[PDB]
Design a binder for this molecule. Structure first.
Ligand SMILES: [Cu+2]
Ligand SMILES: [Cu+2]
Ligand SMILES: [K+]
Ligand SMILES: [Zn+2]
Ligand SMILES: [Zn+2]
Lengths: 165, 164
């Protein structure tokens, strides 16, 4: 069969900020053993402001303008659902929740997801931008008009394209 | 499965680092239909004058920066030898040479029928596009890596091919 659909797939994202956030640097590894399997996500980021930060996969993979996303498209959402928590049934494919940075600015990313895919199914996330937001994802529960659009997590601190190892 | 329908648009943001952080460019890839031709357009600035190999590599991993010497393998799912874009024996990732003149500007307009923006075995999204130090010898160079990668030297700049 087409080798893109075979065996374990490993993907990575090099995460970096720019300008005043050029000190935010890290990486994530995505591992999915089989088409029907969960995806494990592991990594570290350093240089972050302490506290929670939304972690989302965007519909665009376009980084010609750095971490500035020109398109208005929003989070990766091929099933046209509303913004939710990773464990919610009403979520975008790109809704991976919050990560946490300690007071030294280190974040240990350690999570598993059953909605994203590293295989070319409709939930494919390769070739899209992974975003680390300024503040926390309210999981669609904040009562803000944009709570159900993107969790009201603010601007972008750092970005990277999810791609093949 | 929408990854195999309609027209697909992809982009690569090309950048150097270190002594070559002035190298900056972008390319757009357009493929209107599965198995249709792919049209490539863009520009790169800041390059040393002359010809530079342009290849899609097997890895998309940018986590060690662009200038590694660990990932020299071109995208080659069909296990052929390195060649020119028009050669019959070529890698999927073999896009030949671009040219930069004395301004350091390279203008790129290409059409390819080997790469794919759809997830067939010739899929190039999620892989690194590499601009090399010097020219691709198109497999006609006599170095022991002429048929492996065209003997184009190290890397000047990279960019991941991703969805628009
Ligand atoms: Cu977001
Ligand atoms: Cu090359
Ligand atoms: K073809
Ligand atoms: Zn969302
Ligand atoms: Zn080659």
């Amino acid at each position: 069969v087409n080798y893109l659909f075979r065996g374990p797939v490993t993907a990575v994202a090099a995460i970096a900020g720019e300008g005043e956030h050029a000190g935010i640097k890290g990486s994530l590894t995505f591992l999915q053993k089989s088409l029907d399997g969960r995806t494990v996500i592991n990594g570290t980021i350093s240089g972050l402001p302490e506290g929670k930060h939304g972690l989302h996969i965007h519909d665009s993979g376009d980084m010609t303008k750095g971490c500035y996303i020109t398109t208005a498209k929003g989070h990766l959402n091929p099933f046209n659902l509303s913004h939710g928590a990773p464990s919610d049934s009403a979520r975008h494919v790109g809704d991976l929740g919050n990560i946490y940075a300690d007071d030294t600015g280190i974040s240990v990313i350690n999570l598993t997801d059953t909605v994203i895919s590293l295989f070319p199914t409709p939930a494919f996330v390769i070739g899209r931008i992974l975003v680390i937001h300024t503040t926390y994802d309210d999981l669609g529960r904040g009562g803000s008009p944009v709570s159900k659009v993107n969790g009201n997590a603010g601007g972008r601190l750092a970005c990277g394209i999810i791609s093949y190892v």
